[PDB]
Amino acid sequence: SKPGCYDNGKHYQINQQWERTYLGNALVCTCYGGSRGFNCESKPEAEETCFDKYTGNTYRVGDTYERPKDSMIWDCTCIGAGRGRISCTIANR
């Protein structure tokens, strides 16, 4: 039994922050203890906005917007966050 935070082959102390990588991309990490653990995250850069490479409009992350494409309707969601994860899944109903 012993607390601490082992990452990147280093021995940091709880409540400590360090820089890592998720597979192969920037990814910071913050220790919360031996029980809470740590939650990594990519170099923050203001999360709350889109672009819509399709046309290039402005949409928030807290709002959905359908997008008619082809003979199939989908409900695209401005799931930017990290950058742009606009998920478009067929209508629920």
JSON list of C-alpha atoms in Angstrom, two decimals:
[
{"chain": "A", "resi": 1, "resn": "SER", "atom": "CA", "xyz": [0.00, 0.00, 0.00]},
{"chain": "A", "resi": 2, "resn": "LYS", "atom": "CA", "xyz": [1.45, 3.32, -1.14]},
{"chain": "A", "resi": 3, "resn": "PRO", "atom": "CA", "xyz": [0.19, 6.41, -3.04]},
{"chain": "A", "resi": 4, "resn": "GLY", "atom": "CA", "xyz": [1.94, 8.32, -5.81]},
{"chain": "A", "resi": 5, "resn": "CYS", "atom": "CA", "xyz": [1.72, 8.75, -9.57]},
{"chain": "A", "resi": 6, "resn": "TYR", "atom": "CA", "xyz": [3.91, 6.79, -11.99]},
{"chain": "A", "resi": 7, "resn": "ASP", "atom": "CA", "xyz": [3.93, 8.17, -15.54]},
{"chain": "A", "resi": 8, "resn": "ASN", "atom": "CA", "xyz": [6.34, 8.42, -18.47]},
{"chain": "A", "resi": 9, "resn": "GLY", "atom": "CA", "xyz": [8.68, 6.37, -16.31]},
{"chain": "A", "resi": 10, "resn": "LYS", "atom": "CA", "xyz": [8.73, 9.18, -13.76]},
{"chain": "A", "resi": 11, "resn": "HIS", "atom": "CA", "xyz": [7.66, 9.28, -10.11]},
{"chain": "A", "resi": 12, "resn": "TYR", "atom": "CA", "xyz": [5.62, 12.45, -9.62]},
{"chain": "A", "resi": 13, "resn": "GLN", "atom": "CA", "xyz": [3.68, 13.46, -6.50]},
{"chain": "A", "resi": 14, "resn": "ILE", "atom": "CA", "xyz": [-0.10, 13.56, -6.22]},
{"chain": "A", "resi": 15, "resn": "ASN", "atom": "CA", "xyz": [-1.70, 16.80, -7.41]},
{"chain": "A", "resi": 16, "resn": "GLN", "atom": "CA", "xyz": [1.23, 17.03, -9.83]},
{"chain": "A", "resi": 17, "resn": "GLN", "atom": "CA", "xyz": [0.97, 17.70, -13.56]},
{"chain": "A", "resi": 18, "resn": "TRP", "atom": "CA", "xyz": [3.14, 16.34, -16.37]},
{"chain": "A", "resi": 19, "resn": "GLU", "atom": "CA", "xyz": [3.22, 16.24, -20.17]},
{"chain": "A", "resi": 20, "resn": "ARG", "atom": "CA", "xyz": [2.53, 12.97, -21.98]},
{"chain": "A", "resi": 21, "resn": "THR", "atom": "CA", "xyz": [1.17, 11.73, -25.32]},
{"chain": "A", "resi": 22, "resn": "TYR", "atom": "CA", "xyz": [-1.93, 9.78, -26.32]},
{"chain": "A", "resi": 23, "resn": "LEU", "atom": "CA", "xyz": [-0.56, 7.19, -28.73]},
{"chain": "A", "resi": 24, "resn": "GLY", "atom": "CA", "xyz": [1.54, 9.83, -30.46]},
{"chain": "A", "resi": 25, "resn": "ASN", "atom": "CA", "xyz": [0.17, 13.30, -29.75]},
{"chain": "A", "resi": 26, "resn": "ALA", "atom": "CA", "xyz": [0.48, 15.94, -27.03]},
{"chain": "A", "resi": 27, "resn": "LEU", "atom": "CA", "xyz": [-1.35, 14.90, -23.87]},
{"chain": "A", "resi": 28, "resn": "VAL", "atom": "CA", "xyz": [-0.99, 16.50, -20.44]},
{"chain": "A", "resi": 29, "resn": "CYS", "atom": "CA", "xyz": [-1.83, 14.62, -17.25]},
{"chain": "A", "resi": 30, "resn": "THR", "atom": "CA", "xyz": [-2.86, 15.60, -13.72]},
{"chain": "A", "resi": 31, "resn": "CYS", "atom": "CA", "xyz": [-2.56, 13.35, -10.66]},
{"chain": "A", "resi": 32, "resn": "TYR", "atom": "CA", "xyz": [-5.45, 13.34, -8.20]},
{"chain": "A", "resi": 33, "resn": "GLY", "atom": "CA", "xyz": [-4.09, 10.71, -5.82]},
{"chain": "A", "resi": 34, "resn": "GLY", "atom": "CA", "xyz": [-3.64, 6.97, -5.49]},
{"chain": "A", "resi": 35, "resn": "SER", "atom": "CA", "xyz": [-7.38, 6.37, -5.64]},
{"chain": "A", "resi": 36, "resn": "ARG", "atom": "CA", "xyz": [-8.68, 9.12, -7.92]},
{"chain": "A", "resi": 37, "resn": "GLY", "atom": "CA", "xyz": [-5.82, 8.57, -10.36]},
{"chain": "A", "resi": 38, "resn": "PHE", "atom": "CA", "xyz": [-5.02, 11.00, -13.17]},
{"chain": "A", "resi": 39, "resn": "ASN", "atom": "CA", "xyz": [-6.87, 12.22, -16.26]},
{"chain": "A", "resi": 40, "resn": "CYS", "atom": "CA", "xyz": [-4.70, 12.99, -19.29]},
{"chain": "A", "resi": 41, "resn": "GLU", "atom": "CA", "xyz": [-5.71, 15.59, -21.88]},
{"chain": "A", "resi": 42, "resn": "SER", "atom": "CA", "xyz": [-4.40, 17.05, -25.13]},
{"chain": "A", "resi": 43, "resn": "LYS", "atom": "CA", "xyz": [-2.83, 20.52, -25.03]},
{"chain": "A", "resi": 44, "resn": "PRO", "atom": "CA", "xyz": [-5.96, 22.59, -24.22]},
{"chain": "A", "resi": 45, "resn": "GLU", "atom": "CA", "xyz": [-6.94, 25.22, -26.79]},
{"chain": "A", "resi": 46, "resn": "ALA", "atom": "CA", "xyz": [-10.36, 26.66, -25.95]},
{"chain": "A", "resi": 47, "resn": "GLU", "atom": "CA", "xyz": [-13.05, 24.04, -26.58]},
{"chain": "A", "resi": 48, "resn": "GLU", "atom": "CA", "xyz": [-16.42, 25.41, -27.72]},
{"chain": "A", "resi": 49, "resn": "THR", "atom": "CA", "xyz": [-16.79, 26.03, -31.46]},
{"chain": "A", "resi": 50, "resn": "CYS", "atom": "CA", "xyz": [-16.73, 24.39, -34.88]},
{"chain": "A", "resi": 51, "resn": "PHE", "atom": "CA", "xyz": [-16.21, 25.37, -38.52]},
{"chain": "A", "resi": 52, "resn": "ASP", "atom": "CA", "xyz": [-17.92, 22.85, -40.79]},
{"chain": "A", "resi": 53, "resn": "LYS", "atom": "CA", "xyz": [-15.23, 22.09, -43.37]},
{"chain": "A", "resi": 54, "resn": "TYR", "atom": "CA", "xyz": [-18.19, 21.28, -45.62]},
{"chain": "A", "resi": 55, "resn": "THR", "atom": "CA", "xyz": [-19.17, 24.93, -45.98]},
{"chain": "A", "resi": 56, "resn": "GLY", "atom": "CA", "xyz": [-17.21, 26.71, -43.27]},
{"chain": "A", "resi": 57, "resn": "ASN", "atom": "CA", "xyz": [-19.89, 28.04, -40.94]},
{"chain": "A", "resi": 58, "resn": "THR", "atom": "CA", "xyz": [-19.87, 28.79, -37.21]},
{"chain": "A", "resi": 59, "resn": "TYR", "atom": "CA", "xyz": [-21.49, 26.40, -34.74]},
{"chain": "A", "resi": 60, "resn": "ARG", "atom": "CA", "xyz": [-21.17, 25.87, -30.99]},
{"chain": "A", "resi": 61, "resn": "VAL", "atom": "CA", "xyz": [-20.34, 22.57, -29.28]},
{"chain": "A", "resi": 62, "resn": "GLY", "atom": "CA", "xyz": [-23.51, 22.76, -27.21]},
{"chain": "A", "resi": 63, "resn": "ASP", "atom": "CA", "xyz": [-25.91, 22.64, -30.15]},
{"chain": "A", "resi": 64, "resn": "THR", "atom": "CA", "xyz": [-26.83, 20.10, -32.82]},
{"chain": "A", "resi": 65, "resn": "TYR", "atom": "CA", "xyz": [-27.60, 20.73, -36.49]},
{"chain": "A", "resi": 66, "resn": "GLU", "atom": "CA", "xyz": [-28.93, 18.24, -39.04]},
{"chain": "A", "resi": 67, "resn": "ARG", "atom": "CA", "xyz": [-27.15, 17.89, -42.38]},
{"chain": "A", "resi": 68, "resn": "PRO", "atom": "CA", "xyz": [-29.03, 16.47, -45.41]},
{"chain": "A", "resi": 69, "resn": "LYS", "atom": "CA", "xyz": [-26.58, 14.44, -47.51]},
{"chain": "A", "resi": 70, "resn": "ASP", "atom": "CA", "xyz": [-27.66, 11.89, -50.11]},
{"chain": "A", "resi": 71, "resn": "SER", "atom": "CA", "xyz": [-30.82, 9.80, -49.82]},
{"chain": "A", "resi": 72, "resn": "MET", "atom": "CA", "xyz": [-30.12, 9.31, -46.11]},
{"chain": "A", "resi": 73, "resn": "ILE", "atom": "CA", "xyz": [-30.74, 11.79, -43.29]},
{"chain": "A", "resi": 74, "resn": "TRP", "atom": "CA", "xyz": [-28.31, 12.09, -40.38]},
{"chain": "A", "resi": 75, "resn": "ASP", "atom": "CA", "xyz": [-28.14, 14.14, -37.18]},
{"chain": "A", "resi": 76, "resn": "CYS", "atom": "CA", "xyz": [-24.67, 15.69, -37.10]},
{"chain": "A", "resi": 77, "resn": "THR", "atom": "CA", "xyz": [-23.44, 16.86, -33.69]},
{"chain": "A", "resi": 78, "resn": "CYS", "atom": "CA", "xyz": [-20.85, 19.60, -33.24]},
{"chain": "A", "resi": 79, "resn": "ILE", "atom": "CA", "xyz": [-18.68, 17.33, -31.09]},
{"chain": "A", "resi": 80, "resn": "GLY", "atom": "CA", "xyz": [-15.57, 19.43, -31.65]},
{"chain": "A", "resi": 81, "resn": "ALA", "atom": "CA", "xyz": [-13.94, 19.49, -28.23]},
{"chain": "A", "resi": 82, "resn": "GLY", "atom": "CA", "xyz": [-10.48, 18.37, -29.30]},
{"chain": "A", "resi": 83, "resn": "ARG", "atom": "CA", "xyz": [-10.92, 19.82, -32.78]},
{"chain": "A", "resi": 84, "resn": "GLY", "atom": "CA", "xyz": [-13.82, 18.51, -34.84]},
{"chain": "A", "resi": 85, "resn": "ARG", "atom": "CA", "xyz": [-15.61, 15.24, -34.13]},
{"chain": "A", "resi": 86, "resn": "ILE", "atom": "CA", "xyz": [-18.84, 16.09, -35.94]},
{"chain": "A", "resi": 87, "resn": "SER", "atom": "CA", "xyz": [-20.63, 12.76, -35.56]},
{"chain": "A", "resi": 88, "resn": "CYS", "atom": "CA", "xyz": [-23.43, 12.19, -38.07]},
{"chain": "A", "resi": 89, "resn": "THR", "atom": "CA", "xyz": [-25.65, 9.22, -37.24]},
{"chain": "A", "resi": 90, "resn": "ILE", "atom": "CA", "xyz": [-28.88, 8.25, -38.98]},
{"chain": "A", "resi": 91, "resn": "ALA", "atom": "CA", "xyz": [-32.02, 9.76, -37.45]},
{"chain": "A", "resi": 92, "resn": "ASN", "atom": "CA", "xyz": [-33.01, 8.11, -34.17]},
{"chain": "A", "resi": 93, "resn": "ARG", "atom": "CA", "xyz": [-36.65, 8.02, -35.27]}
]
